[PDB]
């Protein structure tokens with residue numbers, strides 16, 4: 029029973045905790061043991077939800093936070109309706125305005141390294157990549173940041189709050205030295 033586990037449950041919203049718990053277990057990871065991965069999936073989920081709330085009403089389809097089968101179901105429906113190519117790997121969102129899938133990244137390292145890896149692994153150049161860091165840097169494909177500055181700023185504020193809350197509990201060092 030780790031301190032990090034109790035912190036995650038009081039730091040994040042209960043719907044977000046439960047969706048992340050079900051994601052871990054679906055893919056074989058235990059949240060009471062892999063507690064840094066527990067904190068990271070919650071964080072990534074919250075960012076995805078904040079992001080999809082950043083535009084107008086019907087702008088984004090949310091692919092993250094579903095079980096494997098339904099996420100791929102919604103992707104197939106988006107593809108066979110948009111004409112957009114079917115990604116090799118599950119993205120997080122679909123942008124009905126710009127007509128493209130989005131992969132959202134949250135990293136504790138310099139955003140450049142993490143984008144390279146997601147780019148290299150993405151294979152599908154099709155998919156737009158948006159990286160956020162816990163220090164306030166962001167980095168997006170073709171310098172196109174999709175949302176306007178204020179919706180991106182609130183995401184960065186929340187990321188820095190999570191980092192401070194961890195740091196006040198001595199969990200940040202273990203969290204950063206674990207990515």
Ligand SMILES: C[C@@H](N1CN([C@H]2c3ccccc3CSc3ccccc32)n2ccc(=O)c(O)c2C1=O)C(F)(F)F
Nearest residue numbers: 051052055057065068069072117118119120132133134
């Ligand atoms: C399962 C889906 N994953 C994998 N993996 C994911 C995950 C989920 C459950 C168990 C292990 C892991 C690897 S660790 C991690 C850490 C933070 C946030 C998400 C995650 N991702 C890492 C970064 C992302 O940006 C992202 O979108 C995912 C993601 O969506 C997939 F694409 F493979 F179908």
Ligand SMILES: [Mn+2]
Nearest residue numbers: 092118119120
């Ligand atoms: Mn995802």
Ligand SMILES: [Mn+2]
Nearest residue numbers: 120131132133
């Ligand atoms: Mn992602």
